[PDB]
Design an enzyme around this catalytic site. Structure first.
Site, PDB file in Angstrom:
ATOM      1  N   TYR A   1       0.355  -1.131  -0.214  1.00  0.00           N
ATOM      2  CA  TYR A   1      -0.171   0.033  -0.661  1.00  0.00           C
ATOM      3  C   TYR A   1       0.808   1.391   0.123  1.00  0.00           C
ATOM      4  O   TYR A   1       1.979   0.744   0.395  1.00  0.00           O
ATOM      5  CB  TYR A   1      -0.501  -0.107   0.873  1.00  0.00           C
ATOM      6  CG  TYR A   1      -2.104  -0.989   0.934  1.00  0.00           C
ATOM      7  CD1 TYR A   1      -2.630  -2.075   0.888  1.00  0.00           C
ATOM      8  CD2 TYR A   1      -3.486  -0.298   0.707  1.00  0.00           C
ATOM      9  CE1 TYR A   1      -3.479  -2.660   0.798  1.00  0.00           C
ATOM     10  CE2 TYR A   1      -4.430  -1.887   1.075  1.00  0.00           C
ATOM     11  CZ  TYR A   1      -4.189  -2.201   0.898  1.00  0.00           C
ATOM     12  OH  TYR A   1      -5.387  -2.851   0.536  1.00  0.00           O
TER      13      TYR A   1
ATOM     14  N   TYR B   1      -9.500   2.855  -1.241  1.00  0.00           N
ATOM     15  CA  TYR B   1      -9.835   3.557  -3.104  1.00  0.00           C
ATOM     16  C   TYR B   1     -11.462   3.585  -2.361  1.00  0.00           C
ATOM     17  O   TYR B   1     -11.974   5.050  -3.720  1.00  0.00           O
ATOM     18  CB  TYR B   1     -10.218   2.470  -3.744  1.00  0.00           C
ATOM     19  CG  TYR B   1      -9.182   1.584  -4.703  1.00  0.00           C
ATOM     20  CD1 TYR B   1      -8.752   2.530  -5.505  1.00  0.00           C
ATOM     21  CD2 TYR B   1      -9.548   0.477  -4.320  1.00  0.00           C
ATOM     22  CE1 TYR B   1      -7.588   2.250  -5.997  1.00  0.00           C
ATOM     23  CE2 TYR B   1      -7.958  -0.308  -5.294  1.00  0.00           C
ATOM     24  CZ  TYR B   1      -6.412   0.777  -6.173  1.00  0.00           C
ATOM     25  OH  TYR B   1      -6.032   0.712  -6.697  1.00  0.00           O
TER      26      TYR B   1
ATOM     27  N   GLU C   1      -0.905  -2.018  -7.793  1.00  0.00           N
ATOM     28  CA  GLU C   1      -1.771  -2.533  -8.255  1.00  0.00           C
ATOM     29  C   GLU C   1      -1.148  -3.547  -9.263  1.00  0.00           C
ATOM     30  O   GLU C   1      -0.785  -4.504  -9.374  1.00  0.00           O
ATOM     31  CB  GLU C   1      -3.282  -2.402  -8.526  1.00  0.00           C
ATOM     32  CG  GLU C   1      -3.809  -1.893  -7.893  1.00  0.00           C
ATOM     33  CD  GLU C   1      -3.920  -2.411  -7.274  1.00  0.00           C
ATOM     34  OE1 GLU C   1      -4.138  -3.567  -6.764  1.00  0.00           O
ATOM     35  OE2 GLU C   1      -5.436  -2.188  -5.676  1.00  0.00           O
TER      36      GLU C   1
ATOM     37  N   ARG D   1       1.776  -6.221  -7.901  1.00  0.00           N
ATOM     38  CA  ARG D   1       0.812  -7.121  -7.268  1.00  0.00           C
ATOM     39  C   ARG D   1       0.733  -8.149  -8.086  1.00  0.00           C
ATOM     40  O   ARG D   1       0.011  -9.699  -7.631  1.00  0.00           O
ATOM     41  CB  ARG D   1      -0.044  -6.769  -6.327  1.00  0.00           C
ATOM     42  CG  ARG D   1      -0.553  -6.164  -5.310  1.00  0.00           C
ATOM     43  CD  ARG D   1      -1.791  -5.236  -5.016  1.00  0.00           C
ATOM     44  NE  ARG D   1      -1.907  -4.668  -3.599  1.00  0.00           N
ATOM     45  CZ  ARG D   1      -1.861  -3.405  -2.983  1.00  0.00           C
ATOM     46  NH1 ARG D   1      -3.399  -3.325  -4.148  1.00  0.00           N
ATOM     47  NH2 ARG D   1      -2.156  -3.023  -2.074  1.00  0.00           N
TER      48      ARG D   1
END
Length: 258
Positions: free
Chosen positions: A75, A118, A172, A175
């Site tokens: 994060y 988000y 993202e 990931r």
């Protein structure tokens, strides 16, 4: 703390690919791998001197910002732009103490009153992820918006939209090879598009997938996980096998069985 560099200026599929690769290398230690999938370091007992990595972002406009990521979940917790640093609202005492270890010499430190999730950002942005374009252009602009925030040049909604661009194109992508792949495509053809259902669905299911996998019985999920394809049609995941090409990193959810 380790620093990985990247610039939107003349970015190519290769430069971006090298970038994401270096980030994953700094996020994981290679100690935890399950079913061929790297797991991020467990937060429990992790020394503070190994808690974060920095992502320095530059753009054609010759501006720079450095994002601070938490290795336990990838994060984005805050960023630095010149003499100022901003942090999203910590979610617990541990995280609030942790961030005080970042950008320790910046003249001015600020801690937002909102979180970096988000739901919050989209709300502040005035647009959902499905309506915010991604690509080298949006990233180029995002970097600029983050940089001019402290001088009153960037409005909050635009700053929020900017975070959303950075988080998906960096975290993202780290990931998911899949997501990294979609960004590569955008760069290659220099196109600017909002994320499709496969991208959104993956973003939202990272934690669940990581758990399903890690808690699986030899890779077989107790219960299937529903994802979406680009045309938005449903398609169930029952095993980790079909995710190997898709997920590059998992958040630590439990200890691996013998």
């Amino acid at each position: 703390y380790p620093i990985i560099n990247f610039t939107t200026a003349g970015a190519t599929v290769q430069s971006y690919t090298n970038f994401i690769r270096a980030v994953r290398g700094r996020l994981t230690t290679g100690a935890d791998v399950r079913h061929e999938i790297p797991v991020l370091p467990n937060r429990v007992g992790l020394p503070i001197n190994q808690r974060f990595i920095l992502v320095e972002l530059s753009n054609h406009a010759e501006l720079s910002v450095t994002l601070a990521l938490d290795v336990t979940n990838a994060y984005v917790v805050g960023y630095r732009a010149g003499n100022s640093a901003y942090f999203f609202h910590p979610d617990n005492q541990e995280d609030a103490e942790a961030i005080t270890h970042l950008f320790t010499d910046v003249q001015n430190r600020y801690t937002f009153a909102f979180g970096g999730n988000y739901d919050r950002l989209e709300q502040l942005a005035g647009n959902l992820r499905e309506n915010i374009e991604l690509g080298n252009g949006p990233l180029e602009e995002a970097i600029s918006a983050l940089y001019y925030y402290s001088t009153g040049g960037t409005q909050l909604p635009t700053l929020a939209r900017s975070f959303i661009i950075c988080i998906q194109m960096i975290s993202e992508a780290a990931r998911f090879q899949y997501i990294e792949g979609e960004m590569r495509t955008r760069i290659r053809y220099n196109r600017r598009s909002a994320p499709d259902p496969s991208v959104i669905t993956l973003e939202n299911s990272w934690g669940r997938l990581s758990t399903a996998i890690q808690e699986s019985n030899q890779g077989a999920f107790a219960s299937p996980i529903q994802l979406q394809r680009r045309n938005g049609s449903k398609f169930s995941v029952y095993d980790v096998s079909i995710l190997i090409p898709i997920i590059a990193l998992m958040v630590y959810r439990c200890a691996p069985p013998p």
